[PDB]
From Swiss-Prot:
This is Peptidyl-prolyl cis-trans isomerase A. Its EC number is 5.2.1.8. InterPro entries: Cyclophilin-like_dom_sf (IPR029000), Cyclophilin-type_PPIase (IPR024936), Cyclophilin-type_PPIase_CS (IPR020892), Cyclophilin-type_PPIase_dom (IPR002130). Keywords: Acetylation, Apoptosis, Cytoplasm, Glycoprotein, Host-virus interaction, Isomerase, Isopeptide bond, Nucleus, Phosphoprotein, Rotamase, Secreted, Ubl conjugation. There is a cross-link at residue 27 (Glycyl lysine isopeptide (Lys-Gly) (interchain with G-Cter in ubiquitin)). It is an enzyme of class 5 (isomerase). One of its GO terms (molecular function) is integrin binding. The modification Phosphoserine is found at residue 76. The gene is PPIA. One of its GO terms (biological process) is regulation of viral genome replication. Changing residue 120 to H: No effect on peptidyl-prolyl cis-trans isomerase activity. Belongs to the cyclophilin-type PPIase family. PPIase A subfamily.
Length: 164
């Protein structure tokens, strides 16, 4: 069965709610495994304590830069970067979980959660999961964003891991 992972989100340290994701290991196993592992912290590093640094209402919430907290950092469990695994899955609407990147074959740890259809990213960003529970919490996060992506309070992954 495809893994499920959770993030417990906080706003300036105050608990907001939980978001869970299905990871599509049956279609993108290498990309799913990176995110799953970063969420449990089992390799010794990962998402716990990191922030969502770019949040643009009507577009996406982006996080996963656990090393520099601003879009310039992050790393995968495979090394600094890894290849685009495939583009089987498309950006079909809100709730899609996809890899951020800086060019072909530059996946690290940064990811985004779509809050709109983003079809222009098809074939350029690897889609590897989707929000299961707590899309309403993603919508609540989105309200702390802005047109340029700066957040009006610190949005953090206070805890994270894998659900049965």
């Amino acid at each position: 069965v495809n893994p499920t992972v959770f993030f417990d989100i906080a706003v300036d340290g105050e608990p907001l709610g939980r978001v869970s994701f299905e990871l599509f290991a049956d279609k993108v196993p290498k990309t799913a495994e990176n995110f799953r592992a970063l969420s449990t912290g089992e390799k010794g590093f990962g998402y716990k304590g990191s922030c969502f640094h770019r949040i643009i209402p009507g577009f996406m919430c982006q996080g996963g830069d656990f090393t520099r907290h601003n879009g310039t950092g992050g790393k995968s469990i495979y090394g600094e970067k890894f290849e685009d695994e495939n583009f089987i899955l498309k950006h079909t609407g809100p709730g899609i979980l996809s890899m951020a990147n800086a060019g072909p074959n530059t996946n690290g740890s940064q990811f985004f959660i779509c809050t709109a259809k983003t079809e222009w990213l098809d074939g350029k960003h690897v889609v590897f999961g989707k929000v299961k529970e707590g899309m309403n919490i993603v919508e609540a996060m989105e309200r702390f964003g802005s047109r340029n992506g700066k957040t009006s309070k610190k949005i953090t992954i206070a805890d994270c891991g894998q659900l049965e």
